[PDB]
Amino acid sequence: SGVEGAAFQSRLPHDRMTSQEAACFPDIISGPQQTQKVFLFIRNRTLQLWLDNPKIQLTFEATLQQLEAPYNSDTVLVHRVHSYLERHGLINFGIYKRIKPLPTKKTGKVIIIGSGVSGLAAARQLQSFGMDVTLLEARDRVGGRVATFRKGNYVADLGAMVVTGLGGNPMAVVSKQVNMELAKIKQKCPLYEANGQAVPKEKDEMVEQEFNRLLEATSYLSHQLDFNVLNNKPVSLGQALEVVIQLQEKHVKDEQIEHWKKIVKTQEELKELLNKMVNLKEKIKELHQQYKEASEVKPPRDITAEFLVKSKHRDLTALCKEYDELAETQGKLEEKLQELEANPPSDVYLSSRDRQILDWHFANLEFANATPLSTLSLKHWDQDDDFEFTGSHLTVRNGYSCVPVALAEGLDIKLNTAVRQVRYTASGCEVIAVNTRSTSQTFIYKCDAVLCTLPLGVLKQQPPAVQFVPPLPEWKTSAVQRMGFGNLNKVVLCFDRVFWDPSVNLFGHVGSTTASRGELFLFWNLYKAPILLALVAGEAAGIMENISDDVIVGRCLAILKGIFGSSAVPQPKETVVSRWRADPWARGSYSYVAAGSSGNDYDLMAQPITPGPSIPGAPQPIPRLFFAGEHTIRNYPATVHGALLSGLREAGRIADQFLGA
Amino acid sequence: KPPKGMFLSQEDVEAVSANATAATTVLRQLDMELVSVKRQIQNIKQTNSALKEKLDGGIEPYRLPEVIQKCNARWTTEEQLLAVQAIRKYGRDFQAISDVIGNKSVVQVKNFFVNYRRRFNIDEVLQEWEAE
Ligand SMILES: Cc1cc2nc3c(=O)[nH]c(=O)nc-3n(C[C@H](O)[C@H](O)[C@H](O)COP(=O)(O)OP(=O)(O)OC[C@H]3O[C@@H](n4cnc5c(N)ncnc54)[C@H](O)[C@@H]3O)c2cc1C
Numbered sequence: 001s002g003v004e005g006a007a008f009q010s011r012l013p014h015d016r017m018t019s020q021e022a023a024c025f026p027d028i029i030s031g032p033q034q035t036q037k038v039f040l041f042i043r044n045r046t047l048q049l050w051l052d053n054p055k056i057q058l059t060f061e062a063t064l065q066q067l068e069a070p071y072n073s074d075t076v077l078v079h080r081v082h083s084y085l086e087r088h089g090l091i092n093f094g095i096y097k098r099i100k101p102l103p104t105k106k107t108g109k110v111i112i113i114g115s116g117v118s119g120l121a122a123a124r125q126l127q128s129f130g131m132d133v134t135l136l137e138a139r140d141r142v143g144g145r146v147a148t149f150r151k152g153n154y155v156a157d158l159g160a161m162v163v164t165g166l167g168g169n170p171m172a173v174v175s176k177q178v179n180m181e182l183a184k185i186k187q188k189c190p191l192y193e194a195n196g197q198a199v200p201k202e203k204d205e206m207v208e209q210e211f212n213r214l215l216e217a218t219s220y221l222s223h224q225l226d227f228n229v230l231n232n233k234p235v236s237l238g239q240a241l242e243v244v245i246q247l248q249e250k251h252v253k254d255e256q257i258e259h260w261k262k263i264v265k266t267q268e269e270l271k272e273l274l275n276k277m278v279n280l281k282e283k284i285k286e287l288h289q290q291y292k293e294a295s296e297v298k299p300p301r302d303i304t305a306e307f308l309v310k311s312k313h314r315d316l317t318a319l320c321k322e323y324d325e326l327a328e329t330q331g332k333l334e335e336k337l338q339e340l341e342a343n344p345p346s347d348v349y350l351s352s353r354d355r356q357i358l359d360w361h362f363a364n365l366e367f368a369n370a371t372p373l374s375t376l377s378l379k380h381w382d383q384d385d386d387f388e389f390t391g392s393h394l395t396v397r398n399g400y401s402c403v404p405v406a407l408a409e410g411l412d413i414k415l416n417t418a419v420r421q422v423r424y425t426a427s428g429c430e431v432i433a434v435n436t437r438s439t440s441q442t443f444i445y446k447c448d449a450v451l452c453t454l455p456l457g458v459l460k461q462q463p464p465a466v467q468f469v470p471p472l473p474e475w476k477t478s479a480v481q482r483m484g485f486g487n488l489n490k491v492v493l494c495f496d497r498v499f500w501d502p503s504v505n506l507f508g509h510v511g512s513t514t515a516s517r518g519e520l521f522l523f524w525n526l527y528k529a530p531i532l533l534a535l536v537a538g539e540a541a542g543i544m545e546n547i548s549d550d551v552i553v554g555r556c557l558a559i560l561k562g563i564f565g566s567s568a569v570p571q572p573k574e575t576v577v578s579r580w581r582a583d584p585w586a587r588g589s590y591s592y593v594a595a596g597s598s599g600n601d602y603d604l605m606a607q608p609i610t611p612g613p614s615i616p617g618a619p620q621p622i623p624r625l626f627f628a629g630e631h632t633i634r635n636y637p638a639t640v641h642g643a644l645l646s647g648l649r650e651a652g653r654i655a656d657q658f659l660g661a
Numbered sequence: 662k663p664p665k666g667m668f669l670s671q672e673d674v675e676a677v678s679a680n681a682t683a684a685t686t687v688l689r690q691l692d693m694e695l696v697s698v699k700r701q702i703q704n705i706k707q708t709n710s711a712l713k714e715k716l717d718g719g720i721e722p723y724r725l726p727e728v729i730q731k732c733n734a735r736w737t738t739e740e741q742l743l744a745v746q747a748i749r750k751y752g753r754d755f756q757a758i759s760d761v762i763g764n765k766s767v768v769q770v771k772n773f774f775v776n777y778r779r780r781f782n783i784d785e786v787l788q789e790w791e792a793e
């Protein structure tokens with residue numbers, strides 16, 4: 001439906017109020033069911049009006065004129081709902097033409113560290129709300145980990161490049177606001193073994209299915225066998241897959257032993273039967289000799305001599321009957337023994353070729369999580385799964401940077417300004433920063449509040465890139481330690497001509513060892529100009545950063561030559577290699593749910609810091625230091641949309657604190 | 662509840678995780694275990710192949726022809742004398758006794774046991790059989 005789709009597109013249950021709405025409308029959620037339904041319709045309809053045209057500001061006055069009775073009768077209720085949606089960034093976020101131009105009386109001063117997407121989204125909101133906002137950016141550009149290479153006609157993304165499903169995704173609204181050339185990613189992805197030959201269709205499917213079953217199995221291992229701690233340490237997805245694979249290899253050997261044991265039991269039953277026959281044959285042989293001697297006593301004979309012939313005769317036919325039955329049983333057993341000898345269970349769980357293809361699927365997962373599987377929390381690594389959007393994944397053909405660049409229009413952004421120190425007190429904050437081009441030029445920024453959107457990699461640095469005075473409390477630094485910050489790199493290859501399959505957006509290279517499974521394992525055809533992207537995932541990410549570009553490009557061309565032929569692959573005209581772990585403004589690619597961590601650490605990351613009183617015995621200070629970024633949003637970590645959402649969240653939180661709700 | 666064709670018992674999980682090298686040890690002992698079962702199959706195949714070679718010829722040089730005799734009702738003296746000896750040797754095995762005489766049904770043998778019980782000391786004869 002329509003108002004129902006608006007709720008779904010806003011990641012909201014249409015028939016129930018959220019925790020956040022309860023907080024702002026406690027009178028309604030604690031009240032009768034009828035008013036809750038009126039509220040829910042007002043909310044869903046206001047969302048719909050915004051979504052149905054997100055290029056212009058949805059004002060309260062405009063909203064009321066479009067509501068119909070009975071819902072437009074409590075105008076206080078409508079105004080409250082509208083302002084709630086506006087403040088929390090569910091309507092009038094991103095880039096929209098403003099009806100009422102921004103009032104000149106600016107209230108409050110906020111410094112935002114970082115002008116990636118989270119920092120930018122917050123800044124736009126905070127400006128919309130009337131605050132004075134300045135962003136401090138270390139790099140010479142906006143976007144952070146949204147980073148588009150551009151040279152000539154070549155456009156290729158070194159960071160984020162995929163928009164997940166548009167259903168429920170706030171990037172959908174942004175894509176109606178910015179010219180993004182979104183294109184579906186066809187998921188078909190042929191694999192080529194290390195020798196350049198394609199993986200036959202039978203094997204690609206057998207192993208993908210086994211890969212999926214191995215994952216299920218670890219989840220069984222996690223939930224049903226409570227196998228979550230081993231040797232006093234948290235179990236990882238990697239360990240669990242080892243244990244599952246070891247047990248499938250064990251079951252194959254158990255099945256082999258059971259099989260040959262049925263052969264031994266049967267051979268032995270046959271040995272005992274044969275021994276019974278050679279003895280019976282000898283007994284028959286000797287008895288026949290007796291019958292022969294007795295019947296050669298020519299008649300006329302007395303009746304004992306006759307009894308001897310006739311009873312040896314009878315005794316002999318009985319033994320022959322006994323032997324004929326034992327030979328019928330010998331055929332029944334030589335049957336079982338030949339059927340068994342022809343039904344041997346599987347020889348191996350996975351062949352070497354199998355295991356290598358399986359490793360490509362593991363590398364593909366190491367890609368998705370930007371980390372070796374031995375670091376992923378078995379219990380929690382797929383906790384954001386029940387929030388996946390609906391729809392096809394897409395790429396940004398004109399380069400994802402079009403989004404942060406667009407968001408930056410109109411904001412006060414100081415580029416080439418590396419924050420070194422964040423000072424926060426009961427009376428306000430001071431951010432000390434330097435010019436990255438001459439670190440001696442020092443800058444002091446005084447403000448009411450600091451929104452920190454530094455990447456989790458930067459927060460993790462020892463010794464620190466950015467000092468907090470006073471230091472961050474233990475509950476926050478402990479979260480920063482536990483959370484994973486992973487790594488993932490790309491090689492952009494610009495050719496003058498297309499030698500790959502044009503109707504194929506992905507193809508895989510199957511590395512020959514487990515160790516190297518992440519090394520150039522996947523290639524992307526995403527752009528208009530002939531460009532291939534190559535991924536380095538897992539353990540290979542960090543190791544390939546200490547290898548020169550010329551060698552990395554060399555390894556690529558070697559792989560592609562094997563798949564497409566040596567004559568078909570010219571030298572690239574341009575090449576770029578990302579090194580995200582070494583990037584001091586990133587120190588990795590995105591967060592992952594590490595063993596020993598969990599979803600609650602993402603909440604901890606988002607909790608703002610409140611300084612102590614200046615004067616002792618003085619009233620409780622307000623919070624001064626806020627946090628956003630992909631590492632701060634439990635349900636959508638490690639994404640652009642997750643970062644965007646986290647900025648919208650904090651802007652609402654900051655504005656609630658400094659402008660009043 | 663594990664996926665079909667996955668095998669994951671609590672028992673086996675602990676056996677493969679209780680130690681740093683538990684897994685490879687477990688699988689090594691199953692490798693040697695399988696080796697010694699295959700070794701044992703080889704010895705029996707060869708033992709049985711030798712036994713089959715002794716049964717070369719079946720029992721065919723030793724099977725007599727199967728004669729049928731019209732089951733007659735009258736007891737010749739010679740047929741009575743065969744029964745008494747067959748009792749002495751086979752006891753109450755009425756079938757074997759019939760097969761020896763040739764032309765006497767199982768029942769006819771049974772009837773013989775009573776009608777000539779007195780005159781042939783059949784009781785003494787059965788006692789005589791039970792000694793050896
Ligand atoms: C290789 C790669 C592939 C990815 N692919 C997927 C994908 O395709 N789709 C997707 O949705 N997401 C993907 N992501 C994740 C996504 O890019 C990020 O989650 C998101 O862009 C990060 O946003 P953020 O605003 O939290 O952080 P950032 O964009 O990192 O912003 C923080 C900013 O702070 C700046 N900064 C750092 N230190 C200082 C300092 N001392 N002083 C001042 N400024 C400083 C940084 O330079 C940066 O501009 C990918 C990321 C990478 C790197």
Ligand SMILES: O=CCCc1cc(F)cc(F)c1OCc1ccccc1
Pocket residue numbers: 159160161162164367368590637638639
């Ligand atoms: O290019 C960088 C990939 C960034 C990324 C990080 C995420 F945490 C979630 C994503 F959706 C995502 O991008 C698409 C993707 C989806 C599934 C598996 C792999 C990638």
